[PDB]
């Protein structure tokens, strides 16, 4: 039963090792993309404020 | 203006020549493809007959005859031309393929695509629908090797990787030289139909197992010839 469980573990874990490497890569990419999107939104808001002050002046 | 009109006249005359030439050559290839359909029919008839005999001497437990317990994935083989100038042929085939996709979705199965022909491949690439595998370069003049390969791939996808619990073939039949309707057929799992009121070597069950893939290959081949005649 113990060999059985060891087998189970190895299998699943090597599966979760691959899954966690993929998750690290994907989460890094997704968080970087979210940061870039937030930066783009901030710059768009800055340009909107610039245009608004230009129109006000 | 007159120079442009003369040039347009010359271009239109050249296009007329090319189109008439291809009309006549298309008539020739229609004749040839219909001749090949007729030539292939007797083999299909006889293999169907001995498949019925084997089924009558078989338990009918082969995977390709039993619907999966909970089918969630279904493959679709869309047969299309590899060159244009065929009018609505590809459009009709892919419209029927999309209708089949909608029917499958209403049945809870997401379709997974196999495509024969370049035009359907481009059509699906435009809409970003993944195609597991595609074959091109023979829709005008298919051989049995191509159909055998397609059937082997579909059968392997059915037996299985994630695999598919079911598989359809969408193709344009040739009912008459005036009418070419797109149809969809379920090629696996094959239902069993009872008609009404032999020795085997080495046994009828192994023969049935070896023959069902052959029958699927033969039907895929017949569909390819029908598609070629319809395309012409």
């Amino acid at each position: 039963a113990e060999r059985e469980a060891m087998l189970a573990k190895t299998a699943a874990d090597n599966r979760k090792s691959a899954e966690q490497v993929a998750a690290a890569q994907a989460d890094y990419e997704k968080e970087m993309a979210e940061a870039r999107a937030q930066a783009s939104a901030l710059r768009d808001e800055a340009r909107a404020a610039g245009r608004s002050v230009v129109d006000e002046k | 203006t007159l120079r442009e009109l003369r040039g347009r006249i010359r271009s239109a005359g050249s296009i007329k020549k090319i189109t008439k030439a291809q009309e006549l050559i298309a008539t020739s290839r229609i004749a040839k493809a219909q001749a090949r359909v007729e030539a292939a029919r007797p083999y299909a008839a006889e293999i169907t007959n001995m498949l019925t005999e084997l089924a009558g001497a078989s338990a009918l437990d082969h995977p390709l005859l039993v619907e999966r317990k909970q089918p969630k994935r279904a493959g679709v083989l869309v047969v299309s031309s590899d060159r244009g100038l065929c009018g609505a042929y590809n459009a009709n085939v892919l419209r029927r393929a999309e209708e089949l996709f909608s029917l499958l979705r209403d049945e809870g199965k997401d379709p997974v695509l196999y495509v024969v022909g370049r035009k359907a491949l481009g059509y699906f690439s435009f809409r970003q629908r993944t195609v597991v595998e595609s074959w091109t370069g023979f829709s005008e003049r298919p051989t049995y090797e191509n159909a055998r390969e397609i059937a082997d791939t579909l059968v392997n996808a059915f037996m299985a990787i994630l695999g598919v619990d079911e598989l359809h073939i969408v193709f344009t039949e040739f009912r008459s030289m005036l009418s070419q309707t797109a149809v969809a057929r379920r090629a696996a799992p094959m239902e069993v139909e009872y008609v009404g009121e032999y020795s085997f070597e080495p046994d009828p069950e192994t023969l049935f197992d070896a023959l069902l893939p052959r029958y699927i290959a033969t039907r895929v081949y017949a569909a390819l010839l029908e598609a070629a005649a319809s395309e012409s």
Binding site: - | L100, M190, V192, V195, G196
Partner: protein, 229 residues
């Protein structure tokens, strides 16, 4: 003598020699061609009288090419002599490249597959065309123009998707103007892209591209020869 009318008028536009004060008169005659026919009489007269032509085509104007310069027909016989060294370097062959792109696009309209070189040429040309689009009453200083054409000619737009190219230019030209004005000042004062300035501009473009958001029935049945299951 209508030709002698337009010639007598336009030929007085000249760059006078230093002995006559070194003045100049630049003529931008405007001609309205009927039905997009550049082969008419007066149009051809004025074309032969002038030093270059900008053929604005309605089809291009409707397609999105504003202003609608038919690159193929248009030409400036002064060419590089009427450009600062920077733009002469970053845009030396731009017109011929765009004309070749238009020819390829017309030819490759129905090609099922294309060589990698032809596909790359089409992509570069589309990005250049989008780069050359410009809204009315939105002038760009010469330094901004050389940076914009630098984005396209040098292949820095190759990665940017076509539909976003127009924005990628604008935003970038803002960023530089807001953060790396030294490039613009160098171009304006020296009239050329120094190697150091070119490297700095490439670095700015590559760091900016990081933070840029691109918009991107019947059944086959086995017949069994018996009456019931």
């Amino acid at each position: 003598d209508v030709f002698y009318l337009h010639s007598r008028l336009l030929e007085r536009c000249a760059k006078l020699s230093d002995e006559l004060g070194g003045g100049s008169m630049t003529g931008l005659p405007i001609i309205e061609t009927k039905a997009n026919d550049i082969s008419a009489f007066i149009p051809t007269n004025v074309i032969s009288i002038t030093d270059g032509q900008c053929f604005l085509e309605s089809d291009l104007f409707n397609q999105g090419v504003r202003p609608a310069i038919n690159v193929g027909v248009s030409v400036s016989r002064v060419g590089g002599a009427a450009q600062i060294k920077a733009m002469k370097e970053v845009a030396g062959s731009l017109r011929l490249d765009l004309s070749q792109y238009r020819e390829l696009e017309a030819f490759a309209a129905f090609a099922s597959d294309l060589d990698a070189a032809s596909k790359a040429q089409l992509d570069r040309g589309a990005r250049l065309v989008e780069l050359l689009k410009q809204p009315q009453y939105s002038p760009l200083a010469v330094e901004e123009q050389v940076v914009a054409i630098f984005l396209g000619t040098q292949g820095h737009l190759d990665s940017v998707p076509v539909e976003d190219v127009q924005r990628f230019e604008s935003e970038l030209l803002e960023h530089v103007k807001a953060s790396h004005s030294d490039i613009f000042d160098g171009i304006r004062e020296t009239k050329k892209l120094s190697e150091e300035a070119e490297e700095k501009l490439v670095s700015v473009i590559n760091e900016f591209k990081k933070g840029f958001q691109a918009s991107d029935l019947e059944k086959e049945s086995v017949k069994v020869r018996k009456p019931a299951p």
